[PDB]
Structures are given as C-alpha cells and as structure tokens.
Write a protein that binds this ligand. Structure first.
Ligand code: HEM
Ligand SMILES: CC(C)CCC[C@@H](C)[C@H]1CC[C@H]2[C@@H]3CC=C4C[C@@H](O)CC[C@]4(C)[C@H]3CC[C@]12C
Ligand SMILES: [Cl-]
Length: 439
C-alpha cells in the first residue's frame, strides 16, 4: 500500500465493531483497543470507505479549521437521504456559507437576547408545570418535548401541546435511527421508515408554506423563520423545506440529550445541585424585589456556575462522538499520509476524556471550570455549531426553573450509551417532589 499511512488492521471492514454501543462517558472498547494498539491516528475500512480515524486533538483541530481547503464535510448517504440535499450537512462551498448565514441571523445575538430568551422560559415552564410529583416519568422524553416545541414555535409559530405540534414531533422520532442505519430503502428497515416520515414532514411544511404565502398576499407573518425566509431570502421551495426540516431535527436531538445528561449527572452530584440552587435563588429573589416576572439577558449572564455545569455535561457526556470528513487532496501530517479522497473521522470526543488534559476525566466535576484546544463539543472552524448559544441558553433556563421547583431521583438504574447517538436505553425514568420551603 502506502508506507506512511497510519497503522491499522485494514486499510475486512470494521463498521459493525466501530458502531457497537458503548457507555457514553467513555470512548468504548473498539476505539480504546484501536488506540492502544495502533496509536491515536489509525486506519480502518468504515462506512464502505478507506478511513483515517483521529483521536489526536491537534489533528482534529487542524481538520476542522481547514474545512473547504484540505478537508470537506462528507457524511454517509443516509444523512442526505433523510435531511435532504439542501441541508447544511450536505451543502459545501458558497451554498453552505449562505445557509449558515441565514441560520446565524436567526440565532443572532440580538434575537437570542430578547425574543428567543423569552420563549425559552415560557416553554420551560410549560413543561415543568405539567410534571406530577411522586410519579415515574421519562426525563429524556420530557427534555425532547421542551426542545422540539421550542423549535417548532421559533420556526413555524406552532404552539406547544396543540394537536399538530404533537403529531409532527411523532414523525421526528424515526429520524435518528434512520440516519445511523444502512441506506436500504426497503419495507421494514429503519431507513425506509425515516424516509416515510420525511415525506410526511415535507408535505406538512410545504402546505404551511403555501398558507403563509397567501397570508402575505392578504397582508396579514414574518416573525418566525418560515416567514423570514419567504420575505427576506431567495431560497427555493425545496431549500426552505430542507432548512426547516433539518432545524426541527436539531431541535429534537441535540440540546434535549444534553439536558437529560445534566439531569442524570446532577442527581449523582448533590453538592452541585445545592450550589445551583443558591445561584438561581439569588437571581429569583433579586427579580422579586424589582417586581420582574420574566428572565432577561442580564439574569442569564449571572448564571456562572450553571455554565460550569453545562460545560462539564457536554465534556463528559459527548452528545456528538465524531464527525465525518474527507480529504480534498493528499495531506502529510506529522509524517502520516492522509490520501486524497479518503474518509477522515475526527473523534472530537476523544480530547474530552483524555486523562492528560482533564484530571479524572470520567468524573463529573463542574468545579474544574470555575474561575478557569481541549474542548470541542460543538465542532469547529467554519462549521462550528450555529445553534451553540441557543443550546446553552436552553440548558441554563431549564436548569434555573428545574432546581427552584423540584428535587428528583432516578426511578431505576440507567446510564447513557452511544449508538453513536447518545440515549438512555431505559428512558431516564425519574420521580420529582416539589420544594415548598427554600433555604
Ligand atoms: C448541546 C447541543 C448541541 C451540540 C453538542 C451540537 C453539536 C454540533 C456539531 C458537532 C456540529 C457540527 C457538525 C459538522 O461540522 O459535521 C453542529 C452543527 C450545527 N448545529 Fe449544533 N449542536 C447542538 C445544538 C444545536 C441547536 C439547538 C441547533 C439549533 C438549530 C443547532 C444547529 C446547528 C447547525 C445549524 C449546524 C450547522 C453549522 C454549519 O454547517 O455551518 N445545533 N452542531
Ligand atoms: C443540519 C443542521 C440543521 C444541524 C444538525 C445538528 C445535529 C443534528 C448534528 C450535528 C452532529 C451530527 C452527528 C455527527 C456524526 C454522526 C455520525 C454518523 O455516522 C451518524 C449521524 C451522526 C450521529 C450525526 C447526527 C446529527 C448531528 C448530532
Ligand atoms: Cl510505499
């Protein structure tokens, strides 16, 4: 083959072993064994392609920052099949840049600080005020309701707990299993089921688009993303559809996982919950003195220990395990040959769990962040998560009201696994009890 390729078993495929589920607060047996035997940069045959796998933090940074120059986003076909050819995980170059710009304006700082913050709180309370005490229920399911409803409101003005919002959410439950499965469009497979849901979702959104276009004729309307792209962009119908469909997927499957992880880590770390309660009680009490009832951006900026808990939740729990890229030309990195056209997987989660970068890396220790290259849960470079500031705001507002209203406990054993999407197999069943006297 090539003398300076990274070592490996095989440049004979290893996809099944690579994808075998593992405990989400580790890298799993397959990755650990390959790194122990071959080193942090190794070769394999994965997803049908010769592949370089990187658990090396410096190479991962280099890959992400040289997007569009030496490396390019290159996901398996199931992603583009389900999220669409105009989604941001498929688009490259100028079209990707323009889609990203639209996304950034809509999670733009100004809109985020004002209108979005206020909806985030209202949706947090819609969920928390429905919870019954001393009754087993799935925290993972409730977190996805919160974040999906919030996105449906922001993108298409859909109201939470209305029938059409609940039915739309049910369609999204098929997506993640389809995205990670073989792209066999055959009756009964997970990919076929997600494509059927895609068809249903697309029909729903395009009907709402046609209604909104009539509304804009009769001058009734651009306060949500759908209205915005209709009036202020020249995207085509299909481009709008994939933008909306894929942002609702992000609303189902990203920050909801993070919130479920936080609820799990925190019930095993009561000292962190006590310190969160002090922080949030002080914010609430100050607001009550002023007569304020809604959070504002200045309140959010006070949530310093909450940010420590958010950073630690993302570091330990690793919502995203690795990203898909390909080499755009031959790259020779510290002696290793990365040939043109090969797949390249930056395992962004690896640096988070490296005991030479983080003391006791498998421990939930939010104080490692307090008053404090090694942290990339949102990716990096020109594809750095465009929702990251909304994701942190959702987590923080949800924790704010969670710790003020309730104590909680696990109803049974559970722990998160990576499939590679992160999921609590037993649903993170909890019970809550209402706090009647704060300290
Ligand atoms: C803790 C929660 C989240 C995590 C860990 C996360 C992680 C990521 C990662 C790793 C990527 C890069 C994918 C790649 O480059 O291959 C990404 C991209 C993206 N994410 Fe997030 N995300 C989260 C929440 C959100 C939310 C709430 C939204 C709201 C829509 C969002 C929207 C986006 C968008 C639009 C991109 C594409 C950026 C681009 O291609 O330029 N994400 N996310
Ligand atoms: C497209 C825009 C709207 C943003 C999407 C953000 C979220 C949904 C993206 C960012 C990182 C993505 C993950 C990155 C890598 C992989 C591994 C691949 O083998 C299966 C899909 C999976 C697990 C992706 C699932 C979707 C994901 C979590
Ligand atoms: Cl050779």
């Amino acid at each position: 083959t090539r003398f300076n390729l990274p070592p490996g078993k095989s440049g004979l495929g290893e996809t099944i072993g690579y994808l075998k589920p593992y405990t989400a607060t580790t890298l799993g047996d397959f990755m650990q064994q390959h790194v122990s035997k071959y080193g942090k940069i190794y070769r394999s045959n994965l997803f049908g392609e010769p592949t370089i796998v990187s658990a090396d933090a410096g190479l991962n940074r280099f890959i992400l920052q040289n997007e569009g120059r030496l490396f390019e986003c290159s996901y398996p076909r199931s992603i583009g099949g389900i999220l669409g050819k105009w989604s941001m995980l498929v688009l490259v170059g100028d079209m990707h840049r323009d889609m990203r710009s639209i996304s950034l304006n809509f999670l733009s700082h100004a809109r985020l600080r004002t209108i979005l913050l206020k909806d985030v709180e209202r949706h947090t309370l819609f969920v928390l005020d429905s919870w019954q005490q001393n009754s087993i229920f799935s925290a993972q399911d409730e977190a996805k309701k919160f974040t999906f409803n919030l996105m449906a409101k922001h993108i298409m003005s859909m109201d939470p707990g209305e029938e059409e919002t609940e039915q739309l959410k049910k369609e999204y439950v098929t997506f993640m299993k389809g995205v990670v499965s073989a792209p066999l469009n055959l009756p009964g497979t997970a990919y076929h089921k997600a494509l059927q849901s895609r068809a249903t979702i697309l029909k729903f959104i395009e009907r709402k688009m046609e209604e909104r276009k009539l509304d804009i004729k009769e001058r009734k309307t651009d306060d949500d993303l759908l209205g915005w792209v209709l009036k202020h962009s020249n995207l085509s119908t299909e481009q709008i559809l994939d933008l909306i469909l894929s942002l609702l997927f992000a609303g189902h499957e990203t920050s909801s996982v993070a919130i479920a992880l936080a609820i799990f880590f925190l019930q095993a770390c009561p000292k962190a919950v006590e310190e969160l309660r002090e922080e949030h009680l002080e914010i609430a009490r100050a607001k009550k003195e002023l007569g304020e009832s809604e959070l504002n951006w200045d309140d959010y900026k006070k949530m310093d220990f909450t940010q420590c808990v958010i950073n630690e939740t993302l570091r330990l729990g690793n919502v995203v395990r690795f990203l898909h890229r390909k080499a755009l030309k031959d790259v020779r990195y510290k002696g290793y040959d990365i040939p043109s056209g090969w797949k390249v997987l930056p395992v962004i989660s690896a640096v988070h769990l490296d005991n030479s970068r983080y003391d006791q890396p498998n421990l939930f220790n939010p104080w490692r962040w307090q008053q404090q290259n090694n942290y990339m849960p949102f990716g990096g470079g020109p594809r750095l998560c465009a929702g990251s500031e909304l994701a942190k705001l959702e987590m923080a507002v949800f924790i704010h009201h969670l710790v003020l209203k309730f104590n909680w406990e696990l109803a049974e054993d559970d722990k998160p696994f990576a499939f590679p999407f992160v999921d609590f197999p037993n649903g993170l069943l909890i019970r809550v009890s209402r706090i009647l006297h704060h300290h």
